[PDB]
Amino acid sequence: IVGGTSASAGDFPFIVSISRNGGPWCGGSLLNANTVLTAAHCVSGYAQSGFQIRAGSLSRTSGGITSSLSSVRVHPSYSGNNNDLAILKLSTSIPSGGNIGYARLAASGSDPVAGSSATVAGWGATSEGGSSTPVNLLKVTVPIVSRATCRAQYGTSAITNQMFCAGVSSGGKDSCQGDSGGPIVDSSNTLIGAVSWGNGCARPNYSGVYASVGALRSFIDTYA
């Protein structure tokens, strides 16, 4: 996260860190005791055993409850950056309670309205290409950018009905590498997306692009 502040305990009861090979990699969202939602690109085709989920902590490396993966399922229409969601099943069930809880999801067919305030969180870099990452979870608030403006920035084909965008024109506030798969929420803390892609991080006039939970509820609901 670029331009962020430290998340408080319980800000995102459902957030998980996704380590790979013991190191930082992605974020995700705990949907139920047995299931994490993340970005497809975080997991597609990689060795499944390399991943470790941790819930209930502000750190990636201690606290809370861990699990390995039992299975990985990408969206059936995943292609390039499009439809960038995956369902992970956990080898260890994680109970809610305390600072762990399960996400509530954006309504099917909803689409975040331009100008509304969204909050994104993760353990990723704090600058584009930064090598160091924070121990504790960061968050930042950015407005939704209309799909039309996002298509002006990236091209018409590049931004689909299963993506939405968020950021500020001046840049300086965004998700970055290592934040992929983690949550973006609306002002009510309802999960509206997963961190997906963008042109660099926090650049002027290049929004962050998010996989849209509202657009992808059939897949989520079927397999969660």
From Swiss-Prot:
GO molecular function: serine-type endopeptidase activity
Residues marked Required for specificity (site): 174
Enzyme class: hydrolase
Domain Peptidase S1, residue spans: 1-224
Keyword Cell wall biogenesis/degradation: no
Recorded GO CC terms: extracellular region
Family matches, as InterPro entries: Peptidase_S1, Peptidase_S1_PA, Peptidase_S1_PA_chymotrypsin, Peptidase_S1A, Trypsin_dom, TRYPSIN_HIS, TRYPSIN_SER
Domain of life: Eukaryota
Subcellular location: Secreted
Family, similarity comment: Belongs to the peptidase S1 family.
Name of the protein in question: Trypsin
